[PDB]
Structure 1
Amino acid sequence: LQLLNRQQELNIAKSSAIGNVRIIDNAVTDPNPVRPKKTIIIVIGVVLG
């Protein structure tokens, strides 16, 4: 199975059309959390109450 995969991956690489994909921006993490959004949660709680 591993060799079948190696053959398949090699065919995948060989049949690759894109000449060279480039990494413009390496991954970086935003220090401000995206969830939970405290303000909207509190507003929703107050309105629901």
Structure 2
Amino acid sequence: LQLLNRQQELNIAKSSAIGNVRIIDNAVTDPNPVRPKKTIIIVIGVVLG
């Protein structure tokens, strides 16, 4: 009986998988593109000219 109770504890420990890693935020996309950065490009162009 002692091993059977231990076996069940190992069975429940196997199924209760949630562990060291947890997904807080699933990925989403920022709708504003990060490149090219238009304003800084234009400023650099004017200054270079």
TM-score (norm 2): 0.60
Tell me: CA distance 1:33–1:4, structure 2 relative to 1, closer, same or farther (3 Å). farther
Unaligned runs of 5+ in 2: none
Unaligned runs of 5+ in 1: none
Deviation at 1:29, TM superposition (A): 0.3
| CA deviation map 1:15-40 (0-9, x unaligned) | 99993310000000000000000000
Paired-residue identity, %: 100
In the alignment of these two chains, the number of paired residues is 49
Tell me: CA distance 1:14–1:31, structure 2 relative to 1, closer, same or farther (3 Å). same
TM-score (norm 1): 0.60
